[PDB]
Amino acid sequence: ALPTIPYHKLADLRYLSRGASGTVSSARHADWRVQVAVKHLLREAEILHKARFSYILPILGICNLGIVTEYMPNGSLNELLHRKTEYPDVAWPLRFRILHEIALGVNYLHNMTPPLLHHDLKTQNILLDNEFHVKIADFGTIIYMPPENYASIKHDIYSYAVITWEVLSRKQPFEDVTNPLQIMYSVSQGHRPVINEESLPYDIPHRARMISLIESGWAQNPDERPSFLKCLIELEPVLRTFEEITFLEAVIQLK
Amino acid sequence: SALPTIPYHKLADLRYLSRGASGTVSSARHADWRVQVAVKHLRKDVLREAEILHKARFSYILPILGICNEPEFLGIVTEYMPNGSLNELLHRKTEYPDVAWPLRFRILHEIALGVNYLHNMTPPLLHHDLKTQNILLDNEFHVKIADFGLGGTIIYMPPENYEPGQKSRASIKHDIYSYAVITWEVLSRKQPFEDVTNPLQIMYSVSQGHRPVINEESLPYDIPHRARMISLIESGWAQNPDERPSFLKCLIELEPVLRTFEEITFLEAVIQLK
Ligand SMILES: CS(=O)(=O)c1cccc(Nc2nccc(-c3sc(N4CCOCC4)nc3-c3cccc(NS(=O)(=O)c4c(F)cccc4F)c3)n2)c1
Ligand SMILES: CS(=O)(=O)c1cccc(Nc2nccc(-c3sc(N4CCOCC4)nc3-c3cccc(NS(=O)(=O)c4c(F)cccc4F)c3)n2)c1
């Protein structure tokens, strides 16, 4: 049973971001005494109360039309990666925890009955909680879209491989390509964000393995791309090489 | 709004945590989800209780991840809280010599935010067994309330519940009494009614009017906002249920005390435990 929130309970309302999916605004719940987020514009809402896991954005209720969720104080992964002035240093332990937690969230979705596929994964909708843990949300840009999409369980892995490339480089994929149709043409032809020392330096922990994960993930042939299970099996040994305190020290470095 | 069914064999690396009245608690890993979980080993009565608790969608309430519906055993699968309970933080002074005031106040504010949410549900969800053993701590030491009262300690029980019935079990002012004892225990790192040898003796002292010692040895003068804290404690552990405040009035009181602490001080407090 999904609770019903009356619009008058959502005080201090302030727009966060717009979008085709709906307009998103922050607000403070008068009775709960916490910040929430509301998305203006019912059957799919219950389908998203079934999508309940540690790395999926938690839905708190329904406005009778808006969807109330938790407020992610640290915005999106896009901001963290590309606001190099606010964040000049983003340590590897945290970048690897983000990548691990994205794969966990997507894997849970794919493991539902029926398998729920996101099909719109992008750094913009990889949200960050107060401790910089990932919450997947938002079930214009094409840099994350597989070429065959210009209905497939191999869509999200393509998006994931691009996001991984971006997390590890802090570069905008197809940086020098202004026209999105020119990106779409280079991708249809099997060209991908560049892998070299300028984009992906040698100082990256487990560099070779990450490269092979990225390259297999963004493969032209959908069937040659891994499942999130194979991809999580590859990631588990990498994450084990980081001591718990290094993630905490990585976050404190951002504050 | 569906609660998934988890096949017991999908749970790898099972390891015993604690045996309690409610059942046995173990830490496992879901082979499909690739995450550690906690499984509480305890049919139609249980699936209804699980859905009642499944309604609680709040940051400071322990999330239920699924039910283990085996013909042999019946289990509840929740998120695994890696830092155990508030009790271990408070009393394992060897493992945790220093527990900074910002973390202590963050814990109390989240306990109060958790309970208030439950009391605000329709119909209200009353805990009625709040104790420091069932306030669990996540990886970043944020609170998750667990072990709802559908051989344990009496030290958080209001005197009027001692001989229970219709009024005591439907009482709103039970949870706030337990909160005042937790608050007192949090600021002191002292076992309430430590000196008293018998839990039965504790029961007499309380029913008469005695409470754990609000002095200098227990509560130092260095305690931030010592005044408003001692006020709140005393008000919440009042003999007259009517004289106890709501969790909302308790939050309103707490909020400015929390604004006093800079964000980074909570992070520093955690690095200090770890
Ligand atoms: C400027 S920003 O928008 O990046 C930003 C800055 C600072 C803070 C936040 N905080 C925040 N907190 C909670 C949610 C959100 C956002 S941001 C966003 N934007 C989306 C597009 O890119 C810009 C960010 N979409 C949401 C959002 C809000 C509610 C629901 C959903 N997605 S969903 O509809 O699929 C959904 C449910 F309805 C229910 C349960 C889970 C679930 F995923 C998203 N942002 C934000
Ligand atoms: C030694 S310890 O048990 O304190 C310990 C040490 C290290 C780690 C953990 N981790 C952990 N993680 C999650 C839950 C739990 C515990 S500890 C505990 N103990 C009982 C109290 O005494 C201490 C140990 N009870 C639980 C517990 C497990 C599942 C459910 C519940 N509560 S509930 O059944 O009321 C329930 C639901 F069924 C569904 C949703 C919410 C909900 F609360 C509790 N422990 C633990």
Side-chain angles (χ1 to χ4, degrees), chain A residues 1-17 19-40 42-45 47-255, chain B residues 1-18 20-43 45-47 49-71 73-165 167-274:
Chain A
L2 184 57
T4 321
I5 290 152
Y7 177 85
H8 58 265
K9 280 290 148 200
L10 317 160
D12 274 58
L13 210 107
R14 288 174 175 190
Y15 159 96
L16 267 169
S17 65
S21 47
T23 307
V24 167
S25 307
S26 68
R28 53 146 185 103
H29 196 278
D31 306 337
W32 299 337
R33 314 283 281 170
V34 303
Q35 271 176 295
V36 300
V38 67
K39 189 184 198 187
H40 189 29
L42 197 93
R43 280 198 173 270
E44 285 282 313
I47 307 301
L48 303 191
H49 203 222
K50 293 180 188 253
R52 201 60 185 227
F53 191 55
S54 337
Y55 307 105
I56 310 301
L57 180 64
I59 179 168
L60 304 175
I62 260 293
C63 254
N64 249 298
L65 203 106
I67 296 128
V68 181
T69 77
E70 298 204 336
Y71 170 71
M72 296 299 111
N74 284 299
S76 70
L77 176 56
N78 198 270
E79 296 172 49
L80 183 68
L81 291 180
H82 304 305
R83 289 176 180 186
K84 311 212 201 186
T85 44
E86 195 190 346
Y87 307 118
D89 306 305
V90 183
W92 306 120
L94 177 68
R95 303 201 203 189
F96 284 88
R97 195 182 76 181
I98 291 153
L99 289 168
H100 190 214
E101 295 178 345
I102 296 165
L104 289 164
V106 184
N107 187 66
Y108 171 82
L109 293 176
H110 289 201
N111 256 267
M112 287 167 90
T113 39
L116 165 47
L117 319 156
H118 192 283
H119 285 165
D120 190 42
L121 269 168
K122 54 200 169 196
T123 61
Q124 296 97 271
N125 57 36
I126 300 313
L127 303 174
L128 296 172
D129 75 22
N130 63 345
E131 299 295 356
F132 281 91
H133 292 280
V134 171
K135 306 262 165 300
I136 282 157
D138 196 42
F139 299 98
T141 192
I142 47 82
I143 58 145
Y144 307 105
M145 167 158 276
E148 75 267 2
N149 248 60
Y150 305 157
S152 193
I153 193 161
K154 304 269 163 222
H155 178 348
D156 297 342
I157 192 55
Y158 183 88
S159 299
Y160 186 74
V162 181
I163 294 153
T164 303
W165 182 87
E166 208 175 327
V167 175
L168 296 186
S169 57
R170 289 191 85 180
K171 294 229 190 293
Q172 211 83 31
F174 313 106
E175 172 212 327
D176 288 356
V177 184
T178 54
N179 204 326
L181 295 170
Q182 292 183 280
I183 286 155
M184 285 173 83
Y185 177 82
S186 310
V187 170
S188 73
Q189 298 296 106
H191 303 275
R192 294 294 184 278
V194 194
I195 294 150
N196 60 46
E197 186 204 357
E198 193 207 310
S199 54
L200 307 166
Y202 309 131
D203 55 86
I204 293 172
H206 303 262
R207 190 190 183 270
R209 197 208 293 239
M210 295 313 295
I211 286 156
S212 76
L213 195 21
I214 297 166
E215 291 183 347
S216 50
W218 69 28
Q220 195 71 27
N221 188 358
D223 303 320
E224 295 178 24
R225 292 171 199 158
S227 52
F228 274 80
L229 180 68
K230 155 79 164 158
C231 159
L232 277 161
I233 276 154
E234 292 229 335
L235 288 174
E236 287 168 353
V238 173
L239 268 295
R240 282 197 292 262
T241 83
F242 299 106
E243 296 287 318
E244 179 54 52
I245 201 67
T246 61
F247 306 113
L248 305 193
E249 284 173 10
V251 173
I252 204 154
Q253 190 198 35
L254 303 177
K255 300 250 146 284
Chain B
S1 46
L3 192 34
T5 311
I6 299 173
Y8 182 73
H9 77 101
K10 287 283 127 178
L11 306 174
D13 296 328
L14 266 127
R15 284 193 190 98
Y16 163 86
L17 290 176
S18 77
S22 39
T24 307
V25 166
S26 322
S27 71
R29 71 183 185 90
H30 200 300
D32 290 346
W33 292 345
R34 327 289 302 174
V35 294
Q36 303 191 74
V37 292
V39 56
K40 181 149 110 179
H41 182 174
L42 315 171
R43 197 177 291 265
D45 300 280
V46 182
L47 301 187
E49 285 287 286
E51 293 287 351
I52 288 150
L53 296 179
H54 190 75
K55 264 180 208 166
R57 302 309 216 190
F58 209 59
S59 336
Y60 311 102
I61 312 305
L62 180 63
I64 183 174
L65 292 173
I67 188 109
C68 264
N69 207 347
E70 296 288 322
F73 108 117
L74 212 59
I76 293 153
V77 182
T78 66
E79 263 176 21
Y80 175 67
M81 296 294 103
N83 292 302
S85 66
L86 182 45
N87 195 268
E88 300 174 291
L89 182 65
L90 290 180
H91 306 297
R92 280 170 150 182
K93 323 222 201 163
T94 283
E95 205 187 340
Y96 317 102
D98 217 71
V99 180
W101 305 111
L103 183 54
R104 292 199 211 191
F105 284 80
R106 196 191 54 189
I107 286 155
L108 307 168
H109 181 232
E110 296 171 357
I111 296 170
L113 273 166
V115 185
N116 174 69
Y117 168 91
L118 294 165
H119 287 191
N120 245 277
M121 294 189 90
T122 45
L125 182 40
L126 305 156
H127 193 285
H128 281 210
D129 186 33
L130 264 183
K131 35 160 149 196
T132 69
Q133 294 88 339
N134 60 35
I135 284 132
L136 310 164
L137 304 166
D138 83 19
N139 201 61
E140 279 83 24
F141 286 83
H142 287 286
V143 162
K144 299 262 180 191
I145 300 140
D147 218 50
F148 296 79
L150 274 94
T153 195
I154 38 82
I155 80 174
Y156 312 89
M157 213 194 323
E160 73 275 10
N161 183 208
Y162 281 15
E163 291 172 17
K167 212 189 182 181
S168 71
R169 290 166 190 157
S171 180
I172 290 172
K173 313 279 180 187
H174 183 327
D175 285 338
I176 181 62
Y177 175 102
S178 311
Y179 182 81
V181 184
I182 289 153
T183 305
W184 183 94
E185 198 170 343
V186 158
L187 306 169
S188 73
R189 294 195 73 184
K190 287 283 162 286
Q191 208 62 66
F193 318 93
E194 187 146 68
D195 301 304
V196 195
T197 185
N198 305 295
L200 183 60
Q201 198 45 58
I202 298 159
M203 295 192 82
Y204 298 135
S205 312
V206 179
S207 47
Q208 288 153 18
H210 299 11
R211 293 289 183 274
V213 191
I214 291 180
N215 78 11
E216 183 176 8
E217 195 236 2
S218 64
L219 300 181
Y221 282 96
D222 61 63
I223 294 169
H225 312 250
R226 197 174 178 279
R228 205 191 279 231
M229 267 5 269
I230 292 166
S231 135
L232 195 68
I233 298 182
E234 283 182 333
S235 178
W237 72 22
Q239 214 94 22
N240 180 213
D242 282 351
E243 282 186 296
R244 291 157 178 174
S246 60
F247 261 92
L248 188 117
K249 205 172 130 196
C250 189
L251 279 171
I252 279 157
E253 227 65 47
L254 280 163
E255 286 167 10
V257 183
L258 269 300
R259 276 191 283 269
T260 275
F261 305 93
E262 280 193 12
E263 210 67 70
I264 201 92
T265 66
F266 303 120
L267 301 190
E268 289 170 351
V270 176
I271 275 158
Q272 182 158 34
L273 306 169
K274 233 95 187 203

